[PDB]
Design an enzyme around this catalytic site. Structure first.
Site, PDB file in Angstrom:
ATOM      1  N   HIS A 193      -3.373  -1.829  10.388  1.00  9.43           N
ATOM      2  CA  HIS A 193      -4.370  -1.131   9.601  1.00  9.43           C
ATOM      3  C   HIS A 193      -3.839  -0.984   8.192  1.00  9.43           C
ATOM      4  O   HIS A 193      -2.691  -1.328   7.910  1.00  9.43           O
ATOM      5  CB  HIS A 193      -4.674   0.254  10.184  1.00  9.43           C
ATOM      6  CG  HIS A 193      -3.484   1.161  10.198  1.00  9.43           C
ATOM      7  ND1 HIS A 193      -2.591   1.195  11.246  1.00  9.43           N
ATOM      8  CD2 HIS A 193      -3.017   2.034   9.275  1.00  9.43           C
ATOM      9  CE1 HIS A 193      -1.623   2.054  10.971  1.00  9.43           C
ATOM     10  NE2 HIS A 193      -1.865   2.584   9.784  1.00  9.43           N
ATOM     11  N   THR A 198       2.257   8.525  10.059  1.00 14.56           N
ATOM     12  CA  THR A 198       1.810   9.176   8.829  1.00 14.56           C
ATOM     13  C   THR A 198       0.449   9.841   8.973  1.00 14.56           C
ATOM     14  O   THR A 198      -0.098  10.361   7.999  1.00 14.56           O
ATOM     15  CB  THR A 198       1.734   8.198   7.651  1.00 14.56           C
ATOM     16  OG1 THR A 198       0.735   7.207   7.915  1.00 14.56           O
ATOM     17  CG2 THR A 198       3.081   7.525   7.421  1.00 14.56           C
ATOM     18  N   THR A 199      -0.105   9.798  10.176  1.00 14.48           N
ATOM     19  CA  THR A 199      -1.304  10.572  10.488  1.00 14.48           C
ATOM     20  C   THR A 199      -1.023  11.457  11.689  1.00 14.48           C
ATOM     21  O   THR A 199      -0.123  11.152  12.476  1.00 14.48           O
ATOM     22  CB  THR A 199      -2.508   9.677  10.822  1.00 14.48           C
ATOM     23  OG1 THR A 199      -2.239   8.966  12.032  1.00 14.48           O
ATOM     24  CG2 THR A 199      -2.795   8.688   9.689  1.00 14.48           C
ATOM     25  N   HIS A 232     -10.799   7.051  10.011  1.00 11.59           N
ATOM     26  CA  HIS A 232      -9.635   7.301   9.147  1.00 11.59           C
ATOM     27  C   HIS A 232      -9.165   6.026   8.444  1.00 11.59           C
ATOM     28  O   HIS A 232      -8.613   6.074   7.345  1.00 11.59           O
ATOM     29  CB  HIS A 232      -8.472   7.888   9.952  1.00 11.59           C
ATOM     30  CG  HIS A 232      -8.815   9.144  10.689  1.00 11.59           C
ATOM     31  ND1 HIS A 232      -9.141  10.319  10.044  1.00 11.59           N
ATOM     32  CD2 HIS A 232      -8.868   9.414  12.014  1.00 11.59           C
ATOM     33  CE1 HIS A 232      -9.388  11.255  10.942  1.00 11.59           C
ATOM     34  NE2 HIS A 232      -9.230  10.733  12.145  1.00 11.59           N
ATOM     35  N   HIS A 264       0.194  -1.581   7.523  1.00  8.21           N
ATOM     36  CA  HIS A 264       1.040  -1.114   8.605  1.00  8.21           C
ATOM     37  C   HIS A 264       0.809  -1.952   9.863  1.00  8.21           C
ATOM     38  O   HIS A 264      -0.257  -1.885  10.467  1.00  8.21           O
ATOM     39  CB  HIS A 264       0.752   0.358   8.900  1.00  8.21           C
ATOM     40  CG  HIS A 264       1.251   1.286   7.840  1.00  8.21           C
ATOM     41  ND1 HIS A 264       0.819   2.588   7.721  1.00  8.21           N
ATOM     42  CD2 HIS A 264       2.149   1.090   6.843  1.00  8.21           C
ATOM     43  CE1 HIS A 264       1.433   3.159   6.699  1.00  8.21           C
ATOM     44  NE2 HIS A 264       2.249   2.273   6.153  1.00  8.21           N
ATOM     45  N   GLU A 287       1.319   4.626   0.834  1.00  9.31           N
ATOM     46  CA  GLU A 287       1.901   5.841   1.371  1.00  9.31           C
ATOM     47  C   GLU A 287       3.363   5.939   0.947  1.00  9.31           C
ATOM     48  O   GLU A 287       3.775   6.927   0.331  1.00  9.31           O
ATOM     49  CB  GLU A 287       1.742   5.858   2.884  1.00  9.31           C
ATOM     50  CG  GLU A 287       0.280   5.826   3.315  1.00  9.31           C
ATOM     51  CD  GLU A 287       0.074   6.439   4.680  1.00  9.31           C
ATOM     52  OE1 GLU A 287       0.661   5.923   5.653  1.00  9.31           O
ATOM     53  OE2 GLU A 287      -0.670   7.433   4.782  1.00  9.31           O
ATOM     54  N   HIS A 342      -3.855   1.547   4.391  1.00  7.98           N
ATOM     55  CA  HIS A 342      -4.192   2.743   3.633  1.00  7.98           C
ATOM     56  C   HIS A 342      -4.461   2.273   2.216  1.00  7.98           C
ATOM     57  O   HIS A 342      -3.767   1.392   1.742  1.00  7.98           O
ATOM     58  CB  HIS A 342      -3.042   3.764   3.669  1.00  7.98           C
ATOM     59  CG  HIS A 342      -2.615   4.129   5.058  1.00  7.98           C
ATOM     60  ND1 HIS A 342      -3.052   5.272   5.697  1.00  7.98           N
ATOM     61  CD2 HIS A 342      -1.802   3.493   5.936  1.00  7.98           C
ATOM     62  CE1 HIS A 342      -2.528   5.318   6.911  1.00  7.98           C
ATOM     63  NE2 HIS A 342      -1.772   4.248   7.080  1.00  7.98           N
TER      64      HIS A 342
HETATM   65  C1  LIG Z   1      -2.779  13.038  23.346  1.00  7.10           C
HETATM   66  C2  LIG Z   1      -2.339  12.614  21.982  1.00  7.10           C
HETATM   67  C3  LIG Z   1      -3.458  11.886  21.312  1.00  7.10           C
HETATM   68  C4  LIG Z   1      -1.995  13.827  21.180  1.00  7.10           C
HETATM   69  O1  LIG Z   1      -1.225  11.803  22.091  1.00  7.10           O
HETATM   70  C5  LIG Z   1      -1.251  10.627  21.743  1.00  7.10           C
HETATM   71  O2  LIG Z   1      -1.030   9.655  22.690  1.00  7.10           O
HETATM   72  N1  LIG Z   1      -1.016  10.302  20.365  1.00  7.10           N
HETATM   73  C6  LIG Z   1      -1.323   8.926  20.112  1.00  7.10           C
HETATM   74  C7  LIG Z   1      -0.973   8.346  18.780  1.00  7.10           C
HETATM   75  C8  LIG Z   1      -2.049   7.839  17.883  1.00  7.10           C
HETATM   76  C9  LIG Z   1      -1.727   7.563  16.448  1.00  7.10           C
HETATM   77  O3  LIG Z   1      -1.633   6.255  16.038  1.00  7.10           O
HETATM   78  C10 LIG Z   1      -1.013   5.940  14.851  1.00  7.10           C
HETATM   79  C11 LIG Z   1      -1.127   6.776  13.749  1.00  7.10           C
HETATM   80  C12 LIG Z   1      -0.498   6.458  12.558  1.00  7.10           C
HETATM   81  C13 LIG Z   1       0.251   5.296  12.446  1.00  7.10           C
HETATM   82  S1  LIG Z   1       1.058   4.893  10.923  1.00  7.10           S
HETATM   83  N2  LIG Z   1       0.057   5.199   9.674  1.00  7.10           N
HETATM   84  O4  LIG Z   1       2.232   5.768  10.805  1.00  7.10           O
HETATM   85  O5  LIG Z   1       1.490   3.486  10.947  1.00  7.10           O
HETATM   86  C14 LIG Z   1       0.365   4.457  13.546  1.00  7.10           C
HETATM   87  C15 LIG Z   1      -0.262   4.778  14.737  1.00  7.10           C
HETATM   88 ZN   LIG Z   2      -0.600   3.658   8.695  1.00  8.89          ZN
END
Ligand SMILES: CC(C)(C)OC(=O)NCCCCOc1ccc(S(N)(=O)=O)cc1
Ligand SMILES: [Zn+2]
Length: 257
Positions: free
Chosen positions: A91, A195-196, A61, A116, A103, A93
């Site tokens: 990371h 945002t993901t 991603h 980010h 974003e 975007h």
């Molecule tokens: C079991 C599960 C995977 C559903 O629970 C989790 O522990 N979720 C973990 C989170 C993973 C996502 O990480 C990010 C995604 C997006 C951002 S952003 N683009 O908003 O800065 C940051 C971390």
């Molecule tokens: Zn991000």
């Protein structure tokens, strides 16, 4: 599974992650005229001098640069925040073209990319616990525009050839994230979400007013990465951004007049 294509992109995410239509989703458009100066905000405290980078990973991603977050080595405090937030990864975007990629937007303007830096609230013990709390994360967002090169970004750009496809990782020690910051720490802040997927509503967003500039060559190398794994059909990793979401019952606060 979810992605950024026509058949699995942002418009589809609500089917597996209903919180996609929630009350505090990110990103948003930052309307600069309606953001309000908040004198009650404290200055941002970015303490990155003992940051310990470990690795860079293509996760299908984006690419993440990961840090040792098992001690207070690189922390964010102050501003709108209560307590200490530890840096875990950063990371980006970005777009397929220079006029899109960010974003957050500013008065509907899109930047070429957005950085980010992800931090979690140390009162919750680990990142997995923190994402389940309304004040679990603080993400520092930094816009990228295309102009002169960003010297502090080049070591990231140089390693991307080693992580072209999903699942690939490379050692990435001794990287100093301070080289990615602009001069000014003036910011906007609002409560939002990842945002993901899973789009959890756990983020205090801090978006810097001043963008950093990167060269066309630097962002072109972002665009050579792959969404796919090795041996799979090649799909360029571009336009991995979620569009602006409704502000609803939220006010954006500014640290500056
Ligand atoms: C079991 C599960 C995977 C559903 O629970 C989790 O522990 N979720 C973990 C989170 C993973 C996502 O990480 C990010 C995604 C997006 C951002 S952003 N683009 O908003 O800065 C940051 C971390
Ligand atoms: Zn991000």
């Amino acid at each position: 599974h979810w992605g950024y294509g026509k058949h699995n992109g942002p418009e589809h995410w609500h089917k597996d992650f209903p919180i996609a239509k929630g009350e505090r989703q990110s990103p948003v458009d930052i309307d600069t005229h309606t953001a309000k100066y908040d004198p009650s905000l404290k200055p941002l405290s970015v303490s990155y001098d003992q940051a310990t980078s470990l690795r860079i990973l293509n996760n299908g991603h984006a690419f993440n640069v990961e840090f040792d977050d098992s001690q207070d080595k690189a922390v964010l405090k102050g501003g709108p925040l209560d307590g200490t937030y530890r840096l875990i990864q950063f990371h980006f975007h970005w777009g397929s073209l220079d006029g899109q990629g960010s974003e957050h937007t500013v008065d509907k303007k899109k930047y070429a990319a957005e950085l980010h830096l992800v931090h979690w609230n140390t009162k919750y013990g680990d990142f997995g616990k923190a994402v389940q709390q309304p004040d679990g994360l603080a993400v520092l967002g930094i816009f990228l525009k295309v102009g002169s090169a960003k010297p502090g970004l080049q070591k990231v750009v140089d390693v991307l050839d080693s992580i072209k496809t999903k699942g690939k990782s490379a050692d990435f020690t001794n990287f100093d994230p301070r080289g990615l910051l602009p001069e000014s720490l003036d910011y906007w802040t609002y409560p939002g979400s990842l945002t993901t997927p899973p789009l959890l509503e756990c983020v205090t967003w801090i978006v810097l007013k001043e963008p950093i500039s990167v060269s066309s060559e630097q962002v072109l190398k972002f665009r050579k990465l792959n969404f796919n794994g090795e041996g799979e059909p090649e799909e360029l990793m571009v336009d991995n951004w979620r569009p602006a979401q409704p502000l609803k019952n939220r006010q954006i606060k500014a640290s500056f007049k």
